[PDB]
Structures are given as C-alpha cells and as structure tokens.
C-alpha cells in the first residue's frame, strides 16, 4: 500500500492524510474529494518530489504550498477546477520539472505566471479553454521542451505570443484538435528551435496546408503530424517550403487522400518516415511518390478505397532506401509485372488482406522483387487457393514467408518452394487442404519452423518421412488436422526439434495394444524436445517405453483425453519436467509408481475436472504432496472434487485427511511383534511344562 508511494486512488479521501510515514516521496490522490491544499498541513512533508492531486475538485491552489517542498519535480493538476491563474502561484519555487494542468477551464493568461521555473521541461495546458497561445510577456522557460496546447480554442497563431520561446527548444508542440485558420507571417520563427509539430484533428484544407508548409521556412522541424486533417487533394506546390527544412517524419493519415498529384513530395529529399494509413486514394498516379529516395518506412494500411483502386507500373521506382513497406488491409486488384520494381533496399513487405481476388500464384507474380533482398513476406487473408511452380524463385534472401489464413487447396508437389535457399519460417496454417508428397519439403533443407494448424492434412502416411530433408527443423505444428495414420518412421534425424504440437487429432487408436502391428512409436529420436501438446484426441492407453529419448522435456499436455489408468515407469526419463496438464480426464488414482519422478521438480500442475476416488489407498500420497510443496495448482478449492464414494461426492480433495489409512499408524509392526512374542512365549512355556 505504501512502498515509496502513496496509493490513495479509488479510496475517497476528502483531506490530505497526516499519518503516512515521513519517508515518502511520491503521492497519488487521484479519484478523491480533495478540495483545498493548505500549506500548514504539509509542514511534516518536505522531501517530496512527485505530487498528484488529479481527478479532484480544487478551486484555487494555495500559493505558499511549494515553499516547503524544495524537491518537488512532478506536479499534476489533472481534471481540476482552476480557471484563473495568478503570478504568485509559483514564484519562490523553481525546482519544478513537470507541470500537468489538463482539464482546468483556464480562460486566459494575464502576466507571465510561468516565469520562475528555470527547470521546467514538460508543460501541459491541454483540455483547457485558452483562446490564445500567449503564456508570458518576456523571455522565459529556457529549458522547456514539450508544450502541449491541444484541445483548446486557439484561432490563429502570431509571433507576438510565441516570441517568449526565443531561447528554448520545443521538442514537441502539441497543437492538435484546434481551429487554426490563420498563420501570421513569421509566427513559427519566434521559437529558437522547433522540432516536433502536432496538428491533429484540425480543419486545414489545401489552402491552409500550403500556407502552413510555406510558413515553415528556414525551420529545423523534424516531425510533422497532420493526421485527421481532412486533406483531400495535394499538388506539387503544397509542400513547397519543405525543401528549406530537414524534415524526417511526416504523418498524413485519416485525411481521406482522394487524389495525389505528381511530384507532391518532390520537396522532401531527407524524409525518412512517411505515414499514409487510412485514406481514400482512388488512383495512385505514376509520378506520385517522386523525390522520396530516403524514406525507410512507408505505411499504406487502409490507404486505398474499399470495394477499386488503380495502381500503375513503376509506382515505387524512386523509393530507393525503402526498408519497410506495409500495404495490408487494401483492395489492390492484382500484382502487375512491374509493380514493386526499384526496391533495392527492401527487407519487409506485408500484404495481409491487400488484394480483392488473388487466386492463382504463377511464376510471374513476384518478378518485381528479383532485385530486392526481402526477408519477411506476409501474405494472409488474400484468398489464395492455388500456387503454381516457381512462384517464389525470385526471392532468394526470403527468410520468413507466410501464407496462412487463406483457402489454399492443392497437392504440395515440392516445386513451389524452388528458389528459397535462405528460407527459415513458413506459415501455412488455417487453409483448405494440403496433400503431402515424398519430395514436398525436399527443396527447403534450411527450414527451422513449420506451422500447419487447421489444414486437415492428408497424404502424410507415406513410406518415407515427408519431413526427412528438414534436418534443421525446430518447431513443428500438425494440430487440428484430424490425422489418424502416423508411422514410426516420421521424426528421425530431427534431434533439434524443440516444439511439437499435435492437438485436436485422432491419435487414439495408434497407441493402443489391440491394433495390428502394435503401438506406434513416433516420439523416438527427438532428443531436444521441449514443448509437447496432445490435447483433445481421446487417448485411452499410453505405452511404457514411449517417453525414452525425451530427456529435456519441459512442458507437456495430455489433457482433454480419456485416460483412466497410467502404466508404471513412464516418466523416468523426464529429468527436466516443468509442467503437467492432465485436465478433463478420467484419472482416479494418483500413485507413487506412476507419478513418481513426474512430481519431483514440477512447477505448474493442472488436473482440473478429474474424478478422483476419495480413498486413502489411492490418493494418500497425492494429498500429502498437495499439503506441502512448491508447485502451484490454480483453482484447486472449487474444481478438484470426488465422485466416489457417494458419501464423499462433491467434496474437495484439500479437505481429505490422510491420518486414517493403512500407513497412518504402524499397526503392522505391532502385529509382527505381538505375534512373535506370543509364539515365543507359548513355545517356551510348553518347553518348561514338558521339561
């Protein structure tokens, strides 16, 4: 409650507490009913550095408050009622560093109240009601860096109100959500150094954008955010003055960019980050992105219209240093032959749900990426159904490829993966169907991860292993496919496979002893196996020598099965077991002979919804181990119950007493000693009598 902080939020306090220890330095009086801040009641506290009285209702701030707090650096007045501000509020206190005055109904500034804080770095007057950006009458705020004046009623910007920042560096000037309709000449030049400029949700338009762009002449602006500015159409004269700057970031999002004229960004030679997400581009012209030979990050997510956008050839020829191109969530009709030509420094391309109907993938699809060292390719939700041969031969440096969340339905003959020498990840989950083949993954020996979740995989029961050439495979996922024919010669040589998921299948009849040939052994050879999952398959029997080579097995999952009895000596090789999941099973007894080495160093155990028999002979050691241990069992008091006998039906296992069993009191030793002494006494008395 009180560990170097004063947590008083959601506790409803009217006055400041006077019982907290004097070693405190951070307060938090949010969501309370603080009305006044008397300086006399704060005489006990002097080492304060952080003050928070936000989300309250204070009329005026006591001016002599900060005098007894010489170390105060953070001061928060969020959602308070200080309309008028006086000069004597912060006069003899200069160690202040932050100032939050959000939501205060401040109307206007009279005479430089923010003048005696030489250490002020962050100042915020947002959510207020200021109609002018004048905060002083002379040079002040020498070290101010962030000035947040957003959510105000500022109508126009003038240099006569910004001349107070002539000896400062405004790293961020938050003027978002305003009604700026006029830019007086030389207004932005009154500040010494202007770095950030945030005008979001401000009604500008083409004329206002051109005036703002030409006003920023000879300025050291680095970031410029114009998101939600309703910029419909741009021309080559809009960003005219930007050639006299060193701008490296530009945010033109949520403006519904209908038409983008040619050479609209020709005056941005040093721009590095360009944002164009969420717009309404009708036709991307040929010479639109001209002059952007330095941008290394482009965001075109939802940049085009829904339901069709037109894209001409050689549309990205000038993006030389483009290292990140994101065009997901769009409606491009198809990939042309010269669409992505001119991308020499690309290393990432995301095309998630970017095409209307991209059905077949021929060998001439990604020809524009022949001279592009792509590393991560994302192709999801594109309704891909067929992949022809040599479809990825132009991508030699491709490492992470993804074709998931599609309707891919074809027989993987292995000819589609040609040209992928440096392929590392392939994601093919959530598809229609893929039929394996002897040489399906023979052309990708450098593979390390393969996901096949919910594909209904078939043709896997071949005489050779389809994953045999995958000697470097580490993670394999063959779950949610309803497979029922697995051979033992399927996972040989994959001694570096660490994660293997095989849930939601039909591997029940394969581990049984009543099938022809005997129980299958498909977990052999995997030495570096770490994660295992066999949830929801209906298992009934488990072999004894199946967990032989599973030395480094850390986490396993056998839940949602029909297990009732486990054979002995089946966890002896689990020398590094950490987790166990046997929930939704029919386990009745928990004995030392089959849960011996499993409960040695187990971390998190899960056996929920299991019908244990409330008998001492079956769960005596189980209850004794739950009594004292370090393994945490979540939801144990309301989900670990008994079914039989009916006298203990619906009773938690935690209330089971193990003080009444065949091993509670040593009556066996008593029986032995009593029988022995009785027999010896009878023999000796008969010997004495008979003599």
């Amino acid at each position: 409650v009180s560990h170097e902080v004063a947590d008083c939020s959601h506790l409803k306090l009217t006055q400041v507490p006077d019982d907290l220890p004097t070693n405190i330095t951070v307060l938090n009086l949010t969501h309370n009913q603080l009305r006044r801040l008397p300086a006399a009641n704060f005489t006990r506290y002097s080492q304060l550095t952080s003050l928070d009285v936000g989300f309250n209702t204070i009329s005026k701030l006591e001016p002599e408050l900060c005098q007894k707090l010489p170390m105060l650096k953070v001061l928060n007045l969020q959602h308070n009622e200080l309309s008028q501000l006086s000069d004597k509020t912060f006069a003899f206190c200069t160690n202040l560093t932050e100032l939050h005055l959000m939501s205060n109904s401040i109307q206007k500034i009279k005479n430089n109240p923010f003048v005696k804080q030489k250490n002020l770095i962050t100042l915020d007057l947002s959510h207020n009601g200021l109609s002018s950006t004048k905060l002083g009458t002379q040079v002040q705020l020498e070290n101010l860096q962030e000035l947040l004046l957003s959510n105000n009623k500022i109508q126009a910007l003038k240099s006569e109100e910004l001349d107070i920042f002539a000896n400062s560096s405004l790293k961020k000037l938050e003027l978002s959500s305003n009604q700026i309709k006029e830019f007086s000449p030389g207004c932005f030049h009154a500040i010494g150094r202007l770095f950030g400029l945030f005008l979001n949700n401000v009604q500008l338009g083409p004329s206002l954008t051109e005036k703002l762009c030409l006003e920023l002449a000879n300025t050291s602006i680095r970031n410029l955010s114009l998101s939600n500015s309703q910029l419909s159409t741009t021309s080559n004269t809009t960003f005219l003055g930007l050639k006299w700057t060193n701008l490296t970031m530009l945010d033109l999002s949520y403006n519904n960019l209908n038409v983008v004229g040619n050479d609209s960004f020709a005056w941005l030679p040093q721009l590095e980050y360009f944002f164009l997400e969420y717009n309404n581009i009708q036709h991307l012209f040929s010479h639109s992105l001209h002059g952007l030979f330095n941008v290394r990050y482009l965001n075109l997510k939802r940049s085009f219209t829904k339901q069709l956008p037109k894209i001409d050839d050689f549309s990205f020829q000038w993006l030389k240093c483009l290292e990140h191109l994101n065009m997901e969530d769009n409606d491009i009709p198809g990939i042309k032959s010269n669409m992505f030509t001119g991308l020499i420094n690309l290393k990432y391309l995301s095309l998630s749900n970017s095409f209307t109907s991209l059905r077949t993938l021929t060998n001439e699809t990604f020809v524009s990426l022949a001279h592009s060292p792509l590393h991560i390719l994302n192709l999801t939700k594109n309704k891909i159904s067929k992949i022809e041969s040599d479809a990825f031969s132009w991508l030699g440096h491709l490492e992470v490829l993804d074709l998931g969340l599609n309707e891919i339905g074809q027989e993987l003959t292995g000819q589609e993966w040609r040209g992928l020498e440096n392929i590392f990840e392939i994601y093919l989950s959530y598809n229609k169907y893929l039929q394996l083949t002897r040489n399906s993954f023979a052309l990708v020996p450098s593979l390390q991860r393969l996901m096949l979740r919910r594909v209904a995989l078939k043709n896997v029961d071949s005489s050779p292993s389809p994953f045999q050439p995958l000697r470097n495979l580490t993670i394999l996922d063959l779950s949610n496919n309803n497979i029922a024919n697995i051979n033992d010669d399927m996972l040989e040589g994959l001694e570096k496979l660490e994660i293997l998921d095989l849930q939601h299948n039909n591997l029940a009849r394969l581990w049984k002893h009543a099938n022809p040939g005997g129980p299958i052994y498909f977990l052999k050879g995997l030495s570096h196996l770490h994660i295992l999952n066999l949830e929801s398959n209906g298992f009934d029997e488990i072999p004894v020598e199946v967990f032989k080579d599973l030395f480094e097995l850390k986490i396993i999952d056998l839940g949602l099965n029909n297990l009732n009895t486990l054979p002995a000596s089946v966890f002896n090789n689990q020398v590094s077991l950490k987790s166990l999941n046997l929930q939704k099973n029919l386990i009745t007894s928990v004995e030392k002979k089959v849960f011996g080495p499993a409960f040695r160093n187990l971390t998190e155990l899960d056996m929920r919804f299991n019908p244990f028999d409330c008998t001492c002979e079956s769960i005596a050691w189980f209850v004794n181990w739950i009594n004292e241990t370090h393994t945490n069992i979540p939801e144990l008091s309301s989900h670990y119950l008994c079914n039989t006998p009916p006298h203990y039906h619906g009773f938690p296992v935690r209330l089971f007493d193990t003080s009444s069993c065949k091993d509670s009191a040593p009556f066996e030793l008593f029986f032995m000693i009593n029988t022995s002494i009785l027999l010896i006494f009878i023999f000796i008395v008969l010997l004495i009598h008979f003599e």
């Binding site: 002979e617 079956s618 006998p645 003080s659 009556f667 029986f671 029988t675």
Partner: protein, 483 residues
C-alpha cells in the same frame, strides 16, 4: 497336634477357590475381548466409506465371509482332535492353549489380510470347543476336590479311601458354577465397553441409517433385510483404532497370564499315568462308544437348544428386534442389559438349591417360552420411539431364562457323571453339540423366521427331560462300561 493340618487343609481349600475364581475371570475376560473385537470388526466392515477408503480393492466382504466360515465350520472337525488333545497337555494347559489361540486371533486383527485372518479363524474354530471342554472339566474337578477336602477334614476315618462324596458334591458344584456363569455373562457386558467408549459416538442418528425399513419383528425375512449402506457419520481416526486395539491386546494378555499363573497345577502325575494306562488307540472312539448311553439321547436336544438360544440372544433379539425402534446407538445398552439380567439370574438359580434338581431347568424352559409367544405376535414398528422399556425387559427375561437353563444343565451334567474321564467325554459331547447348533444357526441365517423352530425345540427338550426324570426315578440301571 492337629492345628497345623487344619491350617494346611484351609490353605488348600483357599487355593482351590482362588484358582476357580481366576480361571473364571480369565475365561470371561478373553471371551469379552473376543466378542468385542468381533463386533467392532462387523460394524467397521459394513460401510462403503471405511471399506473403500482404508481397503478399497481388497475384497473385504470375502474376508469376513471366509472368517465367519472358518470360525463356524471348524468346531465340527474339532471332535476329530479334541479328546487326545485334552489328555495330552492336561485339564488346565488346554485352557491356556485356547486363550493363547484367542490372543493370536486378536493379534492378527492389526494388519488384517487374508493369509493372516483365515488361519487365525481356523485356529479359533478348532479351539472354541476344547476351551469349553477343558474349562468345564477343570471347574467340575476342582469342585470335587474342594468337596473331598472338606469331607476328609470333617470326617477323617468316616470317608472311605476311594470315591468319597456319593452324589453329595452338588451344594459345592452349584455354588461354583453359579459364580462362574455370573462372570461369564458379565463378560457379555464387558465386551460392549470398546463400542461404548469409542464406536457408539461415531455412528449418526437412526433417522437415516434406518430409513428403508418397511417391516421388522415377526416380518424380518432375514437378519437385516432393510438397512443403509453406511453407518458411521465420520471415519474413525487410525490413532483411536490402534489405541483401542492395543488396550484389547493388553487386557487379553492380562487374562492369559492370570490364567497361566493364578492356576498352579491341579493334575498330578498319578492320574497322568492312570489315564495313560488306557492308551491312544482307544481314546479316539470312546466319545463314539458313549452313543449307547441312555441319558445322552434325551440330552442332545438340550445342548442343541442351548446353542440355538445363545445364538438367538446374541443376534436374534439384538439384530432382529433391538435394531427396529432404535439403531446402533442403543444396541450396546441392550446387550449390557441382557448381560446384567443373566448375571442376576445366575445368583437367582444359585438360590435354588434346597429344591431338587429338575425344578429350575423346565422353569426356564417355560419363561422364555412365554417370551417366544411375545416374539410371535408383537412386532415393533421401527420408525417410532414410543415404547423402549419392553425391549429391555424382554432381553432381561431372555437372559434370565438363558442363564437359568445353562447353569442348571451344567450342574446336572456335572452331577450325573463323577468319574474324570466321564466328565471329559460328556463335556466334549455337550460342547460339540453346542458347536453344531451354532453352525446350524450360521446356516439358519436369512430365512423367514426361527421362532417356531425355537418353540418346538423347547417343547422337545421339556418332553425329553420329563422322560429322563420319569425313567430315572423308577430305576433303569443302564450305563456303559468302557474302562
């Protein structure tokens, strides 16, 4: 001088008295321990709670069935190995062997398995009959020795050197058998001490364990037709069980050691060589040669009735009528009340000495007979607690009749036969017929009703005793002579 031999004979009579008292005390103590352990194991093994938690997949009902079998069917074969046996160790050492077998059966009750309960049950079955045989022989012989000592002290030269008493040892045999059976029937109350001090507080109220009991009494149709599967509200902790069983072992060992030490030696080698002059090739068939005895054909039904009535007092009235209106909470008090009634009837029959011999016997054969009528018409409603003293008084009168009949038959069989071998064979036949009766009741379980068989058998015994007296007065002079 004469006072030294006076004090000498006084010390011998005091020793005989204290030896009889110690033998009776040890017998009653070991029988109470045995009954208490048997009852505790029967109540503790009739619930799915205990049987499934502590044992589970062990086949416990099979264990109880085989134990009851080996206890109830073995005594028959005891006849094939009891005469020579009681003539091998002696009249007192067989008592010690039997109480040691009882203590061994109690010892095997700790771990409780098949290969340790079945052999102990067989040993108990084969020792239950020689125990009673040697016990009766010892009591009768020591009463005879007390009488002969008293007669040789009060009549030095008048008593002839051989066969002193001439049927005059009845006043000294009856006063011994009376206190003996007093102790033996107080053992019935002593057996209910562990159940009262431990088990009577662990079973819940009769409102749930006596639920599905539609009819009882005359409409029992078995030992326990309707009953709940469980009887204990909470499962007894192992500590209480082990301390109770260790106390039982301690008191059983105390009884055995007091039988061993507080008995001395009352055999002497002269009678040893005298009985060895008969041989082993004949001792096997003398109990089978005595079938030509006239008095035995009329007294065998008496022994059968004694067995049937003790088995009825043990189970028929307590588990057939006492379990109706009240559950297992008041069954122990019922057994203790029966025990006190029998203990009072013991001294009541002790008072009946001035009257001739066959007066109390048939008297008992009447009283419980009336109760039989009460056990034929009256049927108590199980789901009501209105009348509770009727069961108490019925058990009291039944114990009265039981003690009267048993003591009278004991004194009769001790008076009609005075020679030592005769007492041996007659007690052997009596106890074998009693064991046969117990085995028949074991087979006679879960039938319709056994009251008609009881009343017909009592009528048969009454007619047989009347016939025996009527032919004994008019002098037959029939007796077998196989020295």
């Amino acid at each position: 001088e004469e006072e030294e031999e006076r004090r000498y004979y006084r010390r011998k009579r005091l020793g005989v008295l204290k030896n009889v008292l110690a033998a009776s005390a040890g017998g009653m103590l070991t029988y109470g321990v045995y009954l208490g352990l048997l009852q505790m194991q029967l109540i503790l093994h009739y619930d799915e709670t205990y049987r499934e938690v502590k044992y589970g997949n062990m086949g416990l009902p099979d264990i109880d069935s085989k134990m009851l079998m080996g206890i109830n069917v073995t005594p028959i074969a005891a006849l094939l190995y009891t005469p020579v046996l009681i003539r091998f160790f002696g009249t007192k050492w067989m008592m010690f062997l039997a109480v040691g077998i009882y203590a061994l059966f109690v010892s095997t009750n700790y771990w409780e398995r098949y290969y340790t309960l079945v052999p102990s049950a067989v040993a108990l079955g084969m020792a239950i009959v020689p125990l009673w045989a040697s016990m009766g022989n010892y009591i009768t012989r020591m009463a005879q020795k007390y009488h002969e000592y008293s007669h040789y002290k009060e009549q030095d030269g008048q008593g002839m050197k051989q066969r002193p008493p001439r049927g005059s040892h009845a006043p000294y045999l009856l006063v011994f058998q009376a206190i003996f059976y007093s102790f033996f029937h107080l053992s019935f109350a002593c057996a209910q001490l562990p159940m009262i001090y431990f088990l009577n507080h662990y079973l819940y109220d009769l409102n749930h364990t006596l639920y599905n009991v539609q009819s009882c009494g005359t409409n029992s149709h078995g030992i326990l037709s309707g009953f709940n599967k469980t009887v204990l509200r909470t499962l007894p902790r192992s500590g209480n069980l082990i301390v109770v069983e260790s106390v039982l072992m301690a008191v059983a060992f105390l009884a055995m050691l007091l039988v061993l030490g507080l008995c001395g030696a009352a055999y002497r080698p002269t009678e040893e060589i005298d009985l060895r002059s008969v041989g082993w090739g004949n001792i096997f068939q003398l109990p089978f040669k005595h079938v030509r005895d006239y008095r035995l054909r009329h007294l065998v039904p008496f022994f059968i009735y004694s067995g049937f009535e003790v088995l009825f007092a043990c189970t028929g009235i307590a588990l057939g009528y006492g379990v109706c209106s009240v559950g297992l909470e008041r069954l122990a008090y019922l057994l203790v009340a029966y025990s006190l009634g029998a203990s009072a009837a013991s001294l009541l029959g002790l008072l009946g000495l001035w009257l001739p011999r066959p007066v109390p016997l048939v008297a008992g054969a009447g009283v419980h007979l009336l109760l039989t009528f009460i056990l034929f018409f009256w049927a108590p409603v199980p789901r009501v607690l209105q009348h509770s003293w009727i069961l108490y008084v019925a058990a009291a009168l039944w114990g009265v009749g039981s003690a009267l009949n048993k003591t009278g038959l004991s004194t009769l069989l001790g008076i009609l036969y005075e020679d030592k071998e005769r007492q041996d064979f007659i007690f052997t036949i009596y106890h074998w017929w009693q064991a046969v009766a117990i085995f028949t009741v074991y087979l006679g379980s879960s039938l319709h009703m056994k009251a008609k068989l009881a009343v017909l058998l009592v009528t048969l015994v009454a007619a047989a005793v009347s016939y025996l007296r009527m032919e004994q007065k008019l002098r037959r002079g029939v007796a077998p002579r196989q020295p």
